[PDB]
Amino acid sequence: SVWFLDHDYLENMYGMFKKVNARERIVGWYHTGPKLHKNDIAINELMKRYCPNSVLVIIDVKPKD
Amino acid sequence: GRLKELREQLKELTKQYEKSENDLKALQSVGQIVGEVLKQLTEEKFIVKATNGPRYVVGCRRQLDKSKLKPGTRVALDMTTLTIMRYLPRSYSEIGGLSEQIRELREVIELPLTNPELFQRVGIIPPKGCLLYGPPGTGKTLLARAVASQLDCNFLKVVDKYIGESARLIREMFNYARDHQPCIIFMDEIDQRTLMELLNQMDGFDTLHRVKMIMATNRPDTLDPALLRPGRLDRKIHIDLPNEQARLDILKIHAGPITKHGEIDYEAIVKLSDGFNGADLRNVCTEAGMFAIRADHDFVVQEDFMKAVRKVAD
């Protein structure tokens, strides 16, 4: 339950990206640690605010097969 | 009170900012070059030509609906990959006595326009058109647009050959005409192997859509015996000779939309000048109106018509 997503940094990166790419916009968030840590739900709620339907994508640093 | 303007202000603060996002987003489209689908080379690639002239081979981007992209279809292509994108295709009786007009013409124009079943059961192809002939003007210039009124549908007025563009354009507009079955093609003032070739479009070239292509015009000096042969030209209607009473009716009709005292001796006026022509009576009315304009008479006095009658008689 100790999770932080700097709102200022998020907004600034959003603005920069849109300025260089208008068509783009937030669609979700991504995290590693294949075992989805229980915090995810809470974090997703934050994203729900930034995007009404924000999807979570878990990526693996080491692919097996 | 001090808050009411703030509420409206908020809508403004967003409004100008609203445009900024719209402007920024709109500030990136690079446009495209417009061209036409010259041919469908393959289900995956097709030959197209930009308006500038160069011709390339391109393909559908994701789903361009090739079923509807038949040879010839406007499409805009990006000038970085040449891919297919959004496609966008870019008075019933004004001649007084019309018994002659409302009779054979009606019975040969609308009868073949309603019940093709009747004739096909008879086994006879419906007549395609009839020819009117007689005095120029009233019978030729006039009552030509009136046919649309009689049938109550919009018609097309068509005014050896240079390149055959006569028949070419006739066929090219034939599909448009057939799209409207009630529509009637009126090739008035129609005037080797184009008129005779003109005899072949009616037989085929999409002439099975229940439309009477009345070749009604005295203009053509040369008359084709094959056309007047039964079938092609079912029958000929001679424009009736004005009897000076139909002239009275025409004057009354045109006298309608005219402001006058009312004590008009219409019979006297018609006897004054034998215009003989509906357009001549139109000129009579116009000249009476002009004479009224002289001295600034909103009405038209009796002598004004007589001057108009005398003037046209010249």
Curated annotation (Swiss-Prot), chain A:
Keyword Acetylation in annotation: yes
The organism's place on the tree of life at top rank: Eukaryota
Disulphide bridges, residue numbers: none
Keyword Acetylation (UniProt): yes
An example molecular function term from Gene Ontology annotations: protein homodimerization activity
GO cellular component annotations of the record: cytosol; extracellular exosome; extracellular region; ficolin-1-rich granule lumen; membrane; nucleoplasm; nucleus; proteasome complex
The entry's keywords: Acetylation, Isopeptide bond, Proteasome, Ubl conjugation
GO biological process: proteasome-mediated ubiquitin-dependent protein catabolic process
Quaternary data: Component of the 19S proteasome regulatory particle complex. The 26S proteasome consists of a 20S core particle (CP) and two 19S regulatory subunits (RP). The regulatory particle is made of a lid composed of 9 subunits including PSMD7, a base containing 6 ATPases and few additional components. Within the complex, PSMD7 interacts with subunit PSMD4 through their respective MPN domain. Interacts with TRIM5.
Stated family: Belongs to the peptidase M67A family.
Function per UniProt: Component of the 26S proteasome, a multiprotein complex involved in the ATP-dependent degradation of ubiquitinated proteins. This complex plays a key role in the maintenance of protein homeostasis by removing misfolded or damaged proteins, which could impair cellular functions, and by removing proteins whose functions are no longer required. Therefore, the proteasome participates in numerous cellular processes, including cell cycle progression, apoptosis, or DNA damage repair.
Additional free-text comment from the UniProt record: Does not bind a metal ion.
Designated name of the protein: 26S proteasome non-ATPase regulatory subunit 7
Gene from which this protein is expressed: PSMD7
Full-protein residues shown: 66 to 130 of 324
UniProtKB/Swiss-Prot annotation, chain B:
Positions of post-translational N6-acetyllysine modification: 49, 161
Pfam families according to UniProt: AAA, AAA_lid_3, Prot_ATP_ID_OB_C
Domain of life: Eukaryota
SUPFAM superfamilies: P-loop containing nucleoside triphosphate hydrolases
BP terms from Gene Ontology: ERAD pathway; positive regulation of inclusion body assembly; positive regulation of proteasomal protein catabolic process; positive regulation of RNA polymerase II transcription preinitiation complex assembly; proteasome-mediated ubiquitin-dependent protein catabolic process
A molecular function GO annotation: ATP binding
InterPro entries: 26S_Proteasome_ATPase, AAA+_ATPase, AAA_lid_3, ATPase_AAA_core, ATPase_AAA_CS, NA-bd_OB-fold, P-loop_NTPase, Prot_ATP_ID_OB_2nd
Keyword Cytoplasm: yes
Subcellular location: Cytoplasm; Nucleus
PROSITE patterns in alphabetical order: AAA (PS00674)
Residues holding ATP: 134-141
Alphabetic keyword roster: Acetylation, ATP-binding, Cytoplasm, Nucleotide-binding, Nucleus, Phosphoprotein, Proteasome
Recorded GO CC terms: cytosol; cytosolic proteasome complex; extracellular exosome; inclusion body; membrane; nucleoplasm; nucleus; proteasome accessory complex
Function summary: Component of the 26S proteasome, a multiprotein complex involved in the ATP-dependent degradation of ubiquitinated proteins. This complex plays a key role in the maintenance of protein homeostasis by removing misfolded or damaged proteins, which could impair cellular functions, and by removing proteins whose functions are no longer required. Therefore, the proteasome participates in numerous cellular processes, including cell cycle progression, apoptosis, or DNA damage repair.
Entries under PANTHER family matching the protein: 26S PROTEASOME REGULATORY SUBUNIT (PTHR23073)
Family in the record: Belongs to the AAA ATPase family.
Subunit description: Component of the 19S proteasome regulatory particle complex. The 26S proteasome consists of a 20S core particle (CP) and two 19S regulatory subunits (RP). The regulatory particle is made of a lid composed of 9 subunits, a base containing 6 ATPases including PSMC6 and few additional components. Interacts with PAAF1.
Name of the protein this chain belongs to: 26S proteasome regulatory subunit 10B
Organism of this sequence: Homo sapiens (Human)
Lineage of the species this protein comes from: Eukaryota, Metazoa, Chordata, Craniata, Vertebrata
UniProt gene name: PSMC6
